[PDB]
RNA sequence: AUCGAGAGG
């Protein structure tokens, strides 16, 4: 019934937790706040596979 | 003696309005025996109700506002804990300033 | 053979999914009043159908019986308590020498089972007993 | 902040709690293992040496015993294993670290420590299992529950320190709280649900149950009360037997709705000279209400008579309920077939009222009212239409519930339940809401990818037509799960915010003490109030009472 | 606002009046405007009321906002507890805050001030300014382990 | 020590209310068309029905522990077939020369209105009810 | 037949008797089912000494299972409580010693039943200590299971006790007990949707009592005197001897109060 | 500053004894009782050092006096014989 | 706990004779309070007692799957086919007196779980014991025979009571009280104290 | 780790008398009897028989805590009737019904053929 | 991990019934509810003792040591 | 053990709320409470 | 001891 998917380090079973992040190489527009000198921002975070 | 007269002033309005002469005799037909007893319970129950010196009340006051706030949860004004955090912080840029004019 | 597709969250913005495959059935009264109220879909430009709507849940909330009749934080509260329940975590518990292990003497498969339990092997490795429960008021304990 | 303003302490204990109906209010059920561990230094005197010498002889491994012995030289004699732990001969001026015993004063604690009424003193009652036991009617100031909570126990080590718990921090002294100027403790749970069933006009008690019910009151005059029925059979009223627990000299007048002195529905309450006259006892009478029976007896008789009053109501009502019984089950969530028809057609005509308004805004026939947009007037008129329809279904459900419906009986007693719990379980759970609005358009112009774009219908924006008895549809599940998550985050976020608020409050006002000239000052001596509360009163023994001179016509004032 | 007001008979009656509620605040120009009652005007922004209408009017406006967030939830607190808090925010010159820049910058000794926030930074300037502590604070005696002048220690005990 | 009231009444309306073994009663004094009563009555014991006409008595005797009847040595005060014990709590002056009595028999209630018991009933704890067929 | 309580037996078997108890008050027939559960004594295992155990179970797991086995105890009155006898730990006047040893010789799975328990101590001619077997295949209760190469060897002491101390010493299973099937004394308030009569089911004992006439009012002073019981036994004590010892232990228990009054 | 006493005729503090000076009076007495001190009341079968002082107080035999302080530093001494209890 | 967020510890253990019972002699393994039902709105717990009851009698499995056409009305028909009352109620008798319970009790099998929190792995008491090295305060944890913490939230609770003399003893005589010699000129603990 | 041994439910120990008898205060012919190592099987059977004695005024029992197997029994009697004789007659009156019940069942079981 | 001796609730033994129940299912080709009725188990407290039981003992025997 | 193997962490404008996109990819109910509620999600 | 992770109300 053991499903696997885990490691063994020094006899202790260990799991890698999935890590959630925002994707790179996407294009998003943000309304800046009311006391901001600029009105808007288009952003991209450029990543490389 | 002025501060003493100021402090009991609301209570005496309750006293005279209920220990009034038509009221004592027609509404609840007291005898002289019962009336003199009521004058002695009231003087005791009041003098027992006086606060005791040494009572730390600011901690009592702070806890007495603190606990009902922990049970607070939810017509478009800042209510509850953000308003309560607005009030206590002397927040200048409060989220819903309003003006009730008459 | 092109009978099933993999859809992520982005591609699912351009599709229309049914629920039961009975929604794809053409229909043109006498109903069970005790049965719940499903609206007729009134939309028919379907591209996909859900496999089963009960597959939106994880492995812990799939243990829960009748979670559609439950206020939804209770399903959350239960889903963290099923990881505290005691049972047979592995059939080789006697061989393994873990730091802590708790095993039920006489585990029982539940009398009320999710249909997703069979893929979770709960009826093969259960973690509770079917206790005879009386909801009663009796001495006040 | 962590080693001076608060630190870890000796003579402390903590374990899981549960409740005991056969415990008094000021008592705490201390386990024997905790009692054998906790000591109190007792100096030997002629009044105590005959008990203490037997205690030392009884040894640390059973109760009651001692653990150490301190001579005038000041060297501890360990009784766990010494040569002379059996032949000791006590000298005056010596200390015996004896066990915590019955009716010792201990401080009982529950965390978080918001109230003064969360760190109250108790009487020790050494009991033989693993849990901490306490009375049922002390949960509310502690905010305790027997779901897995632990509570801390605290032992004093000086004679005036023991006097400090019993004469200030004791449970009966804290029955009326300065916060809210009202009692914090009242009859709860099965005592409350049974005291309504017992006090019905139709509830009559036979002689055999009566005699057991009289002896169950711990203080008792031995006077069998005269039965309220004589000739066909000597029956008793449930009001007649309950009034034995109410001490004589108590008056309680209260009127609700149509409180004729005929009282056709047995509303209100009239208690005269420790005897009840008319009225079903429920939460208003015997709860923690202002002007309640607990508020009376704590003033009229005293604290110790009110603390003893809790058990005598508990021991009688629990016994009557033990032999009567109570339950719930699904059957008290089922309403009538015709009532289900009236609910499922009520929601349908609410589905028509939203469609017709939506088509009205679709054709731009809108009276642009001032201050809000065209969309904002649409959203308010659909949210309000759907909250009206959920309530109209629940009020349609509460009416169909008969007098024997157990959820209704818990609502009537005030033990557990509210209107909305009847409505969501049996009528319609209602309309879900994230961030205050309706269900948002998380997908592009839709809520779920099973709906067409631009669909502002009730079922597309989180309205749950079905009930918990009926069963939510899978879209209705996810919108409900969306709504409940906000409440889980709100519970999780408000808790850390409110703890920082209360700490800033206490750390600002911590030296505020009524001085001996009654002027509220601080550590520096600066005046804050000249009279505390501007009248110089303690907040307990202050009750609301109408000023009769204000209000009313000038004509009726004069007459 | 269906306000209750005395009838000419003397009894109280409900008198519905039209009331304007705004979405912004400037006190000093709105209250000097014809058509309104400038004796009844009310701002939820109590800090503005402090500088238009005196500090004593800010205190009673501060209490009315605190009382409303409790009464919004349905709870009750006695007057003396809120008004105690409301007085301490007010009993100085202006509005003194319950945050680290507010009461903890007062003249309240030193060691009590270091028990709340900016623990080490307060004790630094206290040694540089050569502060002297009265040691009448609760927190100073809690730290020192002495019996603080609380209710039991307010007085002294003496032989006859 | 003796009888304190005697009359015969005819019933008008019997009302169960929310209860299942008690009924509120509404009846007028027969051969005395100016006095009426209102009383709460156990109906599983004495099933008072509509169009009945029944006698009513109030005694003052015939504190101390209620001992059960040992035998016939303990003799009744009643050829009657329904008896309660109660307590006066108020006396309402309806008008000048018109009075009302208020009785609770452990929550079972009674209101009695007329003006010839002015010499009889009093603000005393003691009260008995007696009703004959 | 005799003055007082009267019994008419409806049905009987080796395994259960169905009977009617009549002209008895209520608290008696209650106090009879209470002693029939847990104050008449039996013999069961109360100490297990283990030698080897290569099985997949734990020793306390099988030791708990061993005590739950029904052993014969018809002649238990000749056997004395071990705390009352003067032996050092256990003798033949106060105890019974069983033994159990098995080996997985077969490649097939080898079971262990309660017939494999072998008595060792001197029985001294009383019907005592035989494991109860009502299984129609001769085997007993299935205690353990063995693999090829696994063995388990232990000795068990069986003592005297009551189910008040542990439920293994329980000679009975379930005491069916219903009085007044028609609800004529109004001892309970039925819960209903429309008709309490159509909702709730007619009990089987409704046949043995008269149907009430709706015109006649509530009998206000009748009490309950006629109770319907079905006592089921495990097999350690035969069914007739459950109630008879239940009667007798109730008799024996009152007399201890009576002789304690004499000592006062 | 230099002897900040108060004459007994001019005393505005409460004639009644506060609970906070009762519990210290009852406590300090039960302390010195527990370390073996004489007792000024016929103890009708009572051994508890607190219960002695509670019965010692209803007969007003405790020879102690509360030095009630004022915020300027002045004080008013009140003997337990003067102080009322309720 | 059950499978529906309903937690709860054990208040008391009752033997089977003290326990209430049905007319077939069936005894509850477990007794829970009805007051923990309406505020929590765990209706599926209540439907579990129905479907499991029919499951044990019929010898079938209970299809408690979500999003099915399984109704409380459809379950209850099957229960009345088995001679029990459709809403799960059963007449119960008191175990003490033997008198019938006036209320009929919702009775059935229900899946219940055993959680890792057991009292005997939680009981902790401490008179005197080991101290920490630097702070000279009691150590942390039952597993090291430690002390409970009298936090500032709990000190805040002691000022409201005015228990001034308890609060000193529990801040000093009950942990890390200590004595140092100081000088009258330099007001610091820089004096040297040769004691004997 | 704290549960008392299960034999304490029915084994007297350390000089615990089976019966303790104490006179009732503010009462006449009234006495209370702390029974020991006993439960509802014996207490509800004595009290139900005391009510059948016409010269018995009051009879009631209670368990002050279900942790412990003990109960208290209070009897009030007619004057000139020692309450111990009311208990003694009723204790003896129980056994007559039981002995007749045992004889009646045995007659019926011997008549039964299975 | 194996058949309990008796039902928890009532105390009627059930351990003698396990091997027979499986032959009523397998060999006699019977459904479950009639199998539990053939074994003399008529109370549902008894009846859930055998129906809901998972015989994990057969998986423990597969490990060789 | 199955639940521990399919669990995501979200280290840190409304991240905790059950978003509409989570349908069929993330369990709506199963998530921890209090400290980091909603950030920890189960597949 | 420190630093972590998980967990309970
Ligand atoms: Mg909890
Ligand atoms: Zn022997
Ligand atoms: Zn120096
Ligand atoms: Zn069973």
From Swiss-Prot, chain B:
Stated name of the protein: DNA-directed RNA polymerase II subunit RPB1
Lineage of source species: Eukaryota, Fungi, Dikarya, Ascomycota, Saccharomycotina
Organism per entry: Saccharomyces cerevisiae (strain ATCC 204508 / S288c)
Family: Belongs to the RNA polymerase beta' chain family.
Record remark on domains: The C-terminal domain (CTD) serves as a platform for assembly of factors that regulate transcription initiation, elongation, termination and mRNA processing.
PTM characteristics: The tandem 7 residues repeats in the C-terminal domain (CTD) can be highly phosphorylated. The phosphorylation activates Pol II. Phosphorylation occurs mainly at residues 'Ser-2' and 'Ser-5' of the heptapeptide repeat. The phosphorylated form of Pol II appears to carry, on average, one phosphate per repeat. The phosphorylation state is believed to result from the balanced action of site-specific CTD kinases and phosphatases, and a 'CTD code' that specifies the position of Pol II within the transcription cycle has been proposed.
Domain of life the protein comes from: Eukaryota
Compartments, as annotated in UniProt: Nucleus
Curated annotation (Swiss-Prot), chain F:
Annotated compartments: Nucleus
Pfam families the record matches: RNA_pol_Rpb8
GO cellular component, one term: RNA polymerase I complex
Keyword DNA-binding: yes
Region: Non-specific ssDNA binding, residue numbers: 15-38
Residue ranges crossing the lipid bilayer per the database entry: none
Entry-annotated residues carrying N-acetylserine: 1
Gene3D superfamilies given in the database record: Nucleic acid-binding proteins
GO biological process: nucleolar large rRNA transcription by RNA polymerase I; ribosome biogenesis; RNA-templated transcription; termination of RNA polymerase I transcription; termination of RNA polymerase III transcription; transcription by RNA polymerase I; transcription by RNA polymerase II; transcription by RNA polymerase III
GO terms for MF: DNA binding; DNA-directed RNA polymerase activity
Entry superkingdom: Eukaryota
Alphabetized UniProt keyword annotations: Acetylation, DNA-binding, DNA-directed RNA polymerase, Nucleus, Phosphoprotein, Ribosome biogenesis, Transcription
InterPro entries according to UniProt: NA-bd_OB-fold, RPABC3
Phosphoprotein found in the keyword field: yes
Comment field (misc): Present with 6210 molecules/cell in log phase SD medium.
Family: Belongs to the eukaryotic RPB8 RNA polymerase subunit family.
Self-association state and partner proteins as the record states: Component of the RNA polymerase I (Pol I), RNA polymerase II (Pol II) and RNA polymerase III (Pol III) complexes. Component of the RNA polymerase I (Pol I) complex consisting of 14 subunits: RPA135, RPA190, RPC40, RPA14, RPB5, RPO26, RPA43, RPB8, RPA12, RPB10, RPC19, RPC10, RPA49 and RPA34. The complex is composed of a horseshoe-shaped core containing ten subunits (RPA135, RPA190, RPB5, RPO26, RPB8, RPB10, RPC10, RPA12, RPC19 and RPC40) where RPA135 and RPA190 form the DNA-binding cleft.
UniProtKB/Swiss-Prot annotation, chain G:
Modified positions (N-acetylserine) in chain numbering: 1
One GO process term, biological-process aspect: transcription by RNA polymerase II
Binding positions for Zn(2+) per the UniProt entry: 85, 87, 91, 94
Compartmental location: Nucleus
Molecular function per GO: DNA binding; DNA-directed RNA polymerase activity; metal ion binding; protein dimerization activity
GO cellular component terms attached to this protein's record: nucleoplasm; nucleus; RNA polymerase II, core complex
Hydrolase listed as a keyword: no
Keyword annotations of the record: Acetylation, DNA-directed RNA polymerase, Metal-binding, Nucleus, Transcription, Zinc
Keyword Ribonucleoprotein: no
Coiled-coil residue spans: none
Subunit-level organization: Component of the RNA polymerase II (Pol II) complex consisting of 12 subunits.
Its job: DNA-dependent RNA polymerase catalyzes the transcription of DNA into RNA using the four ribonucleoside triphosphates as substrates. Component of RNA polymerase II which synthesizes mRNA precursors and many functional non-coding RNAs. Pol II is the central component of the basal RNA polymerase II transcription machinery. It is composed of mobile elements that move relative to each other. RPB3 is part of the core element with the central large cleft and the clamp element that moves to open and close the cleft. Seems to be involved in transcription termination.
Family in the record: Belongs to the archaeal Rpo3/eukaryotic RPB3 RNA polymerase subunit family.
Note: Present with 10000 molecules/cell in log phase SD medium.
Name assigned to this protein: DNA-directed RNA polymerase II subunit RPB3
First and last residues shown, out of full length: 2 to 265 of 318
UniProtKB/Swiss-Prot annotation, chain I:
Subcellular location per the Swiss-Prot or TrEMBL entry: Nucleus
Zn-finger segments (C4-type): 183-196
Binding site for Zn(2+): 183, 186
Function description: DNA-dependent RNA polymerase catalyzes the transcription of DNA into RNA using the four ribonucleoside triphosphates as substrates. Second largest component of RNA polymerases II which synthesizes mRNA precursors and many functional non-coding RNAs. Proposed to contribute to the polymerase catalytic activity and forms the polymerase active center together with the largest subunit. Pol II is the central component of the basal RNA polymerase II transcription machinery.
Subunit structure of this chain's protein: Component of the RNA polymerase II (Pol II) complex consisting of 12 subunits.
Note: The binding of ribonucleoside triphosphate to the RNA polymerase II transcribing complex probably involves a two-step mechanism. The initial binding seems to occur at the entry (E) site and involves a magnesium ion coordinated by three conserved aspartate residues of the two largest RNA Pol II subunits. Present with 18700 molecules/cell in log phase SD medium.
Protein family membership: Belongs to the RNA polymerase beta chain family.
Protein name: DNA-directed RNA polymerase II subunit RPB2
Gene source species: Saccharomyces cerevisiae (strain ATCC 204508 / S288c)
Upper lineage: Eukaryota, Fungi, Dikarya, Ascomycota, Saccharomycotina
Gene (UniProt): RPB2
Shown chain mapped onto the complete sequence: 981 to 1176 of 1224
């Amino acid at each position: 019934f053991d499903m696997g998917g885990y490691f063994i380090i020094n006899g202790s079973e260990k799991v890698l937790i999935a890590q959630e992040r925002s994707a790179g190489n996407i294009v998003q527009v943000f309304k800046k706040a009311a006391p901001s000198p600029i009105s808007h921002v288009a952003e991209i975070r450029s990543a490389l596979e | 003696q002025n501060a003493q007269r100021d402090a009991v002033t609301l209570f005496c309005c309750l006293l005279r309005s209920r220990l009034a002469t038509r009221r004592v005799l027609q509404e609840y037909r007291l005898t002289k025996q019962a009336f003199d007893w009521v004058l002695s319970n009231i003087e005791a129950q009041f003098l027992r109700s006086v606060v005791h010196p040494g009572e730390m009340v600011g901690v009592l006051a702070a806890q007495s506002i603190g606990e009902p706030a922990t049970q607070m949860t939810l017509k478009k004004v800042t209510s509850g804990v953000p308003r309560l955090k607005e009030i206590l912080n002397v927040a200048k840029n409060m989220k819903t300033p309003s003006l009730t004019v008459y | 053979e092109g009978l099933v597709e993999y859809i992520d969250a982005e591609e699912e913005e351009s599709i229309l999914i049914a629920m039961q495959p009975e929604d794809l059935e053409p229909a043109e009264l006498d109903v069970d009043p005790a049965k719940r109220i499903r609206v007729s879909h009134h939309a028919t430009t379907f591209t996909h159908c859900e496999i089963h709507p009960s597959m939106i849940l994880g492995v812990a909330a799939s243990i829960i019986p009748f979670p559609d009749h439950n206020q939804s934080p209770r399903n959350t509260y239960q889903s963290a308590m099923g990881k505290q329940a005691m049972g047979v975590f592995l059939t080789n518990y006697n061989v393994r020498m873990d730091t802590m292990a708790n095993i039920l003497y006489y585990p029982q498969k539940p009398l009320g089972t999710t249909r997703a339990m069979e893929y979770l092997k709960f009826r093969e490795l259960p973690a509770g007993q079917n206790a005879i429960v009386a909801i009663a008021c009796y001495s006040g304990y | 902040r962590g080693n001076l303003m608060g630190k870890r302490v000796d003579f402390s204990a903590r374990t899981v709690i549960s409740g005991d109906p056969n415990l008094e209010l000021d008592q705490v059920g201390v386990p024997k293992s905790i009692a054998k561990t906790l000591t109190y230094p007792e100096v030997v005197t002629p009044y105590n040496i005959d008990r203490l010498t037997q205690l030392v002889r009884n040894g640390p491994n059973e109760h009651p015993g001692a653990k150490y012995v301190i001579r005038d030289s000041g060297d501890r004699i360990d009784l766990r294993y010494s040569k002379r732990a059996g032949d000791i001969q006590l000298q005056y001026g010596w200390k015996v670290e004896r066990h915590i015993m019955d009716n010792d004063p201990v401080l009982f604690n529950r965390q978080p420590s918001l109230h003064k009424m969360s760190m109250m003193a108790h009487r020790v009652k050494v009991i033989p299992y693993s849990t901490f036991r306490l009375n049922l009617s002390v949960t509310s100031p502690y905010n305790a529950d027997f779901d897995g909570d632990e509570m801390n126990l605290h032992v004093p080590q000086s004679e005036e320190t023991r006097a400090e718990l019993s004469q200030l921090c004791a449970v009966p002294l804290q029955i009326v709280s300065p916060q809210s100027n009202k009692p914090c403790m009242g009859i709860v749970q099965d005592t409350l649900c049974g005291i309504r069933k017992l006090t019905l006009r139709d509830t009559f008690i036979e002689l055999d149950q009566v005699l057991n019910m009289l002896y169950w009151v711990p203080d008792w005059d031995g006077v069998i009360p005269t039965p309220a029925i004589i000739k066909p059979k000597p029956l008793w009223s449930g009001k007649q037997i309950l009034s034995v627990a109410i001490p004589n000299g108590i008056h309680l007048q209260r009127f609700d709705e149509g409180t004729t002195l005929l009282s056709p529905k047995d509303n209100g309450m009239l208690i005269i000279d420790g005897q009840i006259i008319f009225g079903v006892v429920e939460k208003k009478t015997v709860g923690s209400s202002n002007g309640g029976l607990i508020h009376v007896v704590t003033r009229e008789k005293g604290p110790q008579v009110c603390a003893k009053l809790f058990g005598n109501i508990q021991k009688v009502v629990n016994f009557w309920l033990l032999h009567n019984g109570f339950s719930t089950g699904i059957g008290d969530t089922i309403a009538d077939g015709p009532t289900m028809r009236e609910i499922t057609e009520t929601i349908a005509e609410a589905k028509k009222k939203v469609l017709d308004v939506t088509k009205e805004a679709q054709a731009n026939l809108l009276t642009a009212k001032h201050g809000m947009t065209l969309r904002e007037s649409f959203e308010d008129n659909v949210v309000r239409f759907l909250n009206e329809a959920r309530d109209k279904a629940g009020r349609l459900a509460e009416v169909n519930l008969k007098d024997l419906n157990n959820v209704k009986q818990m609502v009537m007693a005030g033990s557990k339940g509210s209107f909305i719990n009847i409505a969501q379980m049996s009528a319609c759970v209602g309309q879900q809401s994230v961030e205050g609005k309706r269900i948002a358009f998380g997908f592009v112009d839709r809520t779920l990818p099973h709906f067409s774009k631009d669909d502002y219908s009730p079922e597309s924006k989180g309205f749950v037509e079905n009930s918990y008895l009926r069963g939510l549809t899978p879209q209705e599940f996810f919108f409900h799960a969306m709504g409940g998550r906000e409440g889980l985050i709100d519970t999780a976020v408000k808790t850390a915010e409110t703890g920082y608020i209360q700490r800033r409050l206490v750390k600002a006002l911590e030296d505020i003490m009524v001085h001996y000239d009654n002027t509220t000052r601080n550590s520096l001596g600066n005046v804050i109030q000249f009279i505390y509360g501007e009248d110089g009163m303690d907040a307990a023994h202050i009750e609301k009472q109408s000023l009769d001179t204000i209000g009313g016509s000038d004509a009726a004032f004069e007459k | 606002y269906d306000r209750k007001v005395p009838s000419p008979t003397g009894e109280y009656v409900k008198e519905p009046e039209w009331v304007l509620e705004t979405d912004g605040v400037n006190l000093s120009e709105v209250m000097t405007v014809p058509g309104i009652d400038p004796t009844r005007i009310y701002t939820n922004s109590f800090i503005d009321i402090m500088e238009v209408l005196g500090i004593e009017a800010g205190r009673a406006a501060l209490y009315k906002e605190v009382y409303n967030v409790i009464a919004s939830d349905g709870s009750y607190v006695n007057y003396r507890h809120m008004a105690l808090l409301v007085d301490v925010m007010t009993t100085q010159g202006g509005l003194t805050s319950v945050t680290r820049h507010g009461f903890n910058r007062s003249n309240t000794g030193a060691l009590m001030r270091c028990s709340f926030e900016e623990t080490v930074e307060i004790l630094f300037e206290a040694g540089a300014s050569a502060e002297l502590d009265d040691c009448r604070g609760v927190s100073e005696n809690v730290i020192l382990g002495q019996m603080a002048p609380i209710g039991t220690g307010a007085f002294d005990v003496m032989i006859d | 020590s003796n009888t304190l009231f005697d009359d015969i009444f005819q019933v008008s309306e019997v009302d169960p209310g929310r209860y299942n073994k008690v009924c509120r009663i509404e009846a007028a004094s027969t051969t005395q068309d100016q006095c009426k009563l209102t009383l709460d009555i156990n109906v599983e014991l004495f099933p008072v029905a509509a169009q009945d006409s029944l006698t009513v008595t109030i005694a003052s005797s015939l504190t101390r522990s209620w001992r059960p009847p040992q035998a016939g040595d303990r003799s009744l005060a009643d050829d009657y077939d329904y008896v309660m014990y109660g307590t006066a709590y108020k006396f309402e002056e309806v008008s000048k020369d018109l009075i009302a009595v208020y009785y609770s028999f452990g929550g079972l209630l009674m209101r009695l209105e007329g003006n010839y018991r002015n010499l009889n009933n009093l603000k005393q704890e003691n009260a008995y009810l007696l009703i004959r067929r | 037949s005799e003055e007082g309580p009267q019994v008419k037996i409806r049905e009987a078997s080796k395994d259960n008797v169905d009977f009617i108890l009549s002209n008895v008050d209520l608290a008696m027939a209650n106090s009879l089912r209470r002693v029939m559960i847990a104050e008449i004594p039996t013999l069961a295992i109360d100490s297990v000494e283990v030698e080897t155990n290569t099985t997949v179970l734990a020793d306390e797991f099988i030791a708990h299972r061993l005590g739950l086995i029904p052993l014969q105890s018809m002649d238990i009155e000749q056997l004395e409580y071990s705390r009352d006898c003067f032996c050092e730990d256990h003798c033949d006047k106060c105890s019974v010693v069983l033994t159990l040893q098995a080996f997985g010789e077969s490649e097939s799975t080898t079971n262990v039943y309660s017939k494999d328990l072998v008595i060792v101590s001197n029985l001294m001619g009383r019907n005592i200590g035989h494991p109860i077997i009502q299984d129609k295949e001769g085997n007993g209760v299935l205690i353990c299971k063995l693999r090829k190469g696994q063995e388990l060897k232990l000795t068990c002491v069986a003592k005297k006790g009551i189910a008040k101390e542990h439920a293994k010493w329980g000679p009975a299973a379930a005491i069916e007990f219903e009085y007044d099937p028609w609800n004529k004394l109004k001892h309970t308030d039925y819960w209903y949707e429309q008709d309490s009569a159509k909702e709730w089911p007619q009990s089987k004992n409704c046949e043995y009592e008269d149907p009430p006439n709706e015109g006649d009012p509530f009998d206000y002073k009748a009490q309950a005197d006629t109770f319907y019981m079905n006592v089921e036994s495990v097999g350690s004590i035969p069914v007739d001897q459950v109630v008879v010892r239940g009667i007798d232990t109730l008799q024996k228990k009152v007399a201890s109060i009576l002789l304690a009054l004499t000592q006062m | 500053l230099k002897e900040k006493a108060i004459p007994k005729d001019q005393r505005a503090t409460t004639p009644y004894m506060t609970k906070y000076e009762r519990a210290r009076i009852l406590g300090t007495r039960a302390l010195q009782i527990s370390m073996n001190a004489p007792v000024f009341v016929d103890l009708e079968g009572e051994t508890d050092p607190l219960r002695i002082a509670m019965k010692e107080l209803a007969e007003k035999k405790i020879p102690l006096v509360i030095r009630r302080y004022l915020p300027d530093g002045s004080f008013e001494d009140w003997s337990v014989e003067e102080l009322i209890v309720d | 706990a059950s499978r529906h967020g309903q937690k709860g510890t054990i208040g008391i253990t009752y033997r089977r004779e003290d326990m209430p019972f049905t007319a077939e002699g069936i005894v509850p393994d477990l007794i829970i309070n009805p007051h923990a039902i309406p505020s929590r709105m765990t209706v599926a717990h209540l439907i579990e007692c129905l479907l499991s009851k029919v499951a044990a009698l019929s010898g079938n499995e209970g299809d408690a799957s979500p999003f099915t056409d399984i109704t409380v009305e459809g379950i209850s028909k099957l229960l009345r086919e088995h001679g029990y009352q459709s809403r799960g109620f059963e007449v119960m008798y008191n175990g003490h007196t033997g008198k019938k319970l006036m209320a009929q009790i919702f009775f059935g099998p229900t899946y219940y779980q055993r959680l890792r929190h057991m009292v005997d792995d939680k009981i902790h008491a401490r008179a005197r014991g080991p101290m920490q090295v630097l702070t000279r305060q009691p150590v942390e944890g039952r597993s090291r025979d430690g002390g409970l913490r009298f936090g500032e939230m709990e000190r805040d609770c002691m000022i409201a009571h005015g228990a001034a003399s308890f609060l000193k003893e529990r801040l000093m005589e009950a942990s890390d009280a200590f004595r140092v010699h100081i000088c009258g000129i330099c007001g610091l603990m820089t004096v040297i104290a040769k004691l004997n | 780790m704290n549960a008392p041994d299960r034999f304490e439910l029915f084994l007297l120990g350390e000089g615990e008398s089976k019966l303790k008898i104490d006179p009732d205060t503010k009462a006449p012919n009234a006495v209370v009897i702390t029974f020991e190592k006993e439960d509802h099987t014996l207490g509800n059977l004595i009290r139900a028989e005391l009510l059948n004695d016409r010269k018995v005024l009051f009879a009631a029992y209670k368990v002050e805590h279900p942790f412990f197997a003990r109960f208290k029994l209070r009897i009030q009697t007619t004057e000139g009737y020692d309450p111990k004789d009311a208990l003694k007659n009723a204790c003896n009156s129980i056994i007559n019904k039981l002995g007749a019940l045992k004889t009646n069942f045995e007659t019926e079981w011997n008549l039964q053929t299975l | 991990m194996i058949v309990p001796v008796r039902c928890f609730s009532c105390g009627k033994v059930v351990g003698d019934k396990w091997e027979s129940y499986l032959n009523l299912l397998q060999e006699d080709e019977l459904d479950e509810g009639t199998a539990l009725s053939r074994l003399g188990l008529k109370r549902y407290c008894c009846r859930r003792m055998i129906l809901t039981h998972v015989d994990l003992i057969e998986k423990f025997l597969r490990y060789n040591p | 053990t199955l639940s521990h193997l399919r669990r995501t962490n979200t280290p840190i404008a409304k991240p905790r709320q059950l978003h509409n996109t989570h349908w069929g990819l993330v369990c709506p109910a199963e998530t921890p409470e209090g400290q980091a509620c909603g950030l920890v999600k189960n597949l």
